[PDB]
Each structure stands twice: as structure tokens, then as C-alpha cells.
Fold this protein.
Amino acid sequence: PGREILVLHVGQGGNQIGYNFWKTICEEHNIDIRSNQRKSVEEDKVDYKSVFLVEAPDGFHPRALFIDLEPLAVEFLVKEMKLGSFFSEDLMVLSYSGAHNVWSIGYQTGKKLIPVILEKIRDTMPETLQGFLIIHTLGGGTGSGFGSLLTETLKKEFPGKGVLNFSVLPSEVNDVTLAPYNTVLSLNHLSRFSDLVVLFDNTALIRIVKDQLNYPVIKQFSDLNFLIGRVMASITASLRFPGPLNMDLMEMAHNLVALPETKFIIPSVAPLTKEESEMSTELDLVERCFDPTHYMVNCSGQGKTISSVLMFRGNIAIENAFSIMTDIKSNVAFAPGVHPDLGLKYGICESAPVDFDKEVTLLSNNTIISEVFNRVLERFDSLFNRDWYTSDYVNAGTSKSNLKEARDNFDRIIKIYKEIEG
Ligand SMILES: Nc1nc2c(ncn2[C@@H]2O[C@H](COP(=O)(O)OP(=O)(O)OP(=O)(O)O)[C@@H](O)[C@H]2O)c(=O)[nH]1
Ligand SMILES: [Mg+2]
Ligand code: NA
């Protein structure tokens, strides 16, 4: 017993992403998400289901909480996807009134539900829990504010356990005009209390789906969020299936976080289709992961990699994984202080993702984060310098001084990344 993880889904986006994540986890473990049972004994594989799944005498359940300040996103999701016996009511923490896209309302209002959330965690979490994953968007009010509150709360209440965030940044044109405030307040909070923040944005996700999967249309967020679920599943695969070289959450964080502030990570995965997994080399897949076309954050270029984690899944030639390392270091730009022999952390798992031959997942700590964050800062300043949209932050406990304090700390993080870039 040990290595267990609890996943908290917060707000509309965080819970919708949760559907794709848990669908992927059940499929990888050959669990029927509708019956809660193994699909069969014969195809039960040697694995460690307890990382994300609770086995009870009646069947399997997600080690998850489904948290929102309004009920519709979760209720509609559970009905449409027929999740009623897996996303069960005892795992939901729902209110009625919404955060109205204001971080401060999400933070304040969420405080009222913290006792129930802690009781549920303390009621069912094994003592050996290794950590928490918080799934949320940063541009709305509940994912951002309540997610921030939860990051702070768990790090304070459970010292010694990992707190990792999977966080969706605003799109290149924001689809919430308040998103700069909500994103700066969230990234400030996560810089204080998270151990590692894995970032995504919808501009990059849409580009990948349209250009790598060539979907003719995206009608529901499930046809975008599957990419976030894929990253979450694959970087934990070596906790759940056999393989030559396994790694846990804080093992990956320790290899990535060069300075305490540099905890903001860009993920990528290759290939995106089964057909490509059958006609690709380890070299080709790693090169795709390091290419901006595959980054799940919208970036202007390759940037400079400070540190990276690569998970090789499936039918992997270990000699190829090792021999390409000099080629990665020669062909990918790394930050000036990175020694030629350093900057790579490998995990190798024998389990391929559903029906693929092999797959590589990259977590990159990259100086280009400074460009992504600077753009957020420029959006923030365009509102804040005019005093636009501040009233309902002020009315919910975030003074104008507090907004500025969060902005200035955010800027200090940007400058650390820019300094490392050289
Ligand atoms: N990738 C992805 N983005 C989403 C999803 N749902 C919403 N978004 C994005 O998330 C941001 C809006 O945040 P929501 O998650 O809707 O807000 P919330 O956390 O429910 O907060 P409130 O509605 O303000 O209480 C926008 O940038 C949306 O485009 C989703 O399922 N997947
Ligand atoms: Mg909402
Ligand atoms: Na909303």
C-alpha cells in the first residue's frame, strides 16, 4: 500500500477534463466505467490499480472529488456521459450560486466548503497517500479562485504530500474578459503553494486536434480535453504498469525544478494517432515533442529548455532511447547553464496507451514560459491601469493593492525565467 493519488476537479473545465481523464484511466486498467467492474479476468493485466482507483467489494471507484460552486456543468456531464455510478454523489461537492468569473468570489465562497472537503479527504484517503492533483482552468472564477484556495489548503493541511496542478491558461484571445485578473491571482497562489504546475491552453489544444488528429469538427470539449487526460495518464503510467525505469510525482518534480520558483511546465505528447505510433521512431517522437507544433501551450518557438522529463511508453527500444540523447541535446536549445550531459530525466513503461504501439510524453521546464506569462501580464496591466472590472474583486476581499501585489510577484517569477534564458 502506498503511492495513492487523489484528484480534485474544480469548476466547469476541471470537471469536464475529469471525464476524459477517468475514461482513459479505466480503459488503461480494463475497467468498465459503467459497471465499475473489470471487463474480464483474462485481460486483467499486471498493474497497480490503486494509484487512482479505489477497489471496493462492489467494484472500482475514482479517488476523486468533483467540486464546483454551481451544479450544471457536473450534473449535465454525469447525465450525458452516463457516469452516475462512477462519479457518484458522495464524491461531489457542489453549491448553487457560481463564482461569476471572479477569482475572489471563488476563493471566498469556496472557504465555506473546505470543512466538508477535508472531512471527505480524511474519511477515505489512505495514510500513505503520495499527493493530490488539482485540475482546473485559470480564466474562470471557481477553477481559478477555489482551485487556488484548495492548493493552499492541501499544502497547509497535508505537509509532506505532493500538490500538483494541471491548469488551463486563457486562449490567445481570451474568452473571459476577466481572465487576466483570474490568471494572475491563480498563478501567484500556485507559485506560493503548488509543487508543480503543468499548463495547457485551448489555442494550442485546438491546433493539435485540427492539425495532428485532423478532426473535422470539435463539437464538445471532450474532443479537446482528451489531450489533457492523455498527459495525466501517461506521466503516471510507470506508477501503474511494469517497466524498466519508473518515476513518481515528486521524482519528476525534483528533476524539473532547478530553482524553487521555476515550477511551471509545458507538456507535449507524440504521436497523436495509432497509425503514427506504428510508423515512427523514438527519435522522431522525441523530436515531435520538442517541436512547438506539439506543445500544449501556445508558444512562439522552441524557447530554451531548462530541464525535461520524458516518459517512453510501450514498444520502446531502450538503446534508441539512450542513444538519441546526444541528438536531443545537440538539436534542441537548452538554457545556457545546462551542461551538455544534463537536463533529461527518463521513465520507461512497457504499457502503451490504448491501441498505440508506443508514445512519448514530454514535460518541459522552458524559459519560453516568460513570454507566455508576459502576455498575461500585459493583458492584466491593460485592465488594471484603467481600473476596469476591479469592483467585484474588491467587494469579495481582494483589494486593488492585493491585485497589484499578486501582479508584482507574478512579474518576479517571469524575470527569474528570463534571467535563466540569458
Ligand atoms: N480545455 C477546456 N477549457 C475549458 C473547459 N471548460 C471551460 N473552459 C475554459 O475555461 C475558462 C472558463 O472557466 P470555467 O471552467 O468555465 O469557469 P469555472 O471554474 O466554472 O468558474 P465560474 O463559472 O466563474 O464559477 C474559459 O477560458 C473556457 O474556455 C473545458 O472543459 N476544457
Ligand atoms: Mg462555471
Ligand atoms: Na461559467
Observations:
- Residues 400-421 form the longest helix (22 residues).
- DSSP finds 16 helices and twelve strands in the chain.
- Residues 12, 140 surround sodium ion (ligand 3) (CB under 6 Å).
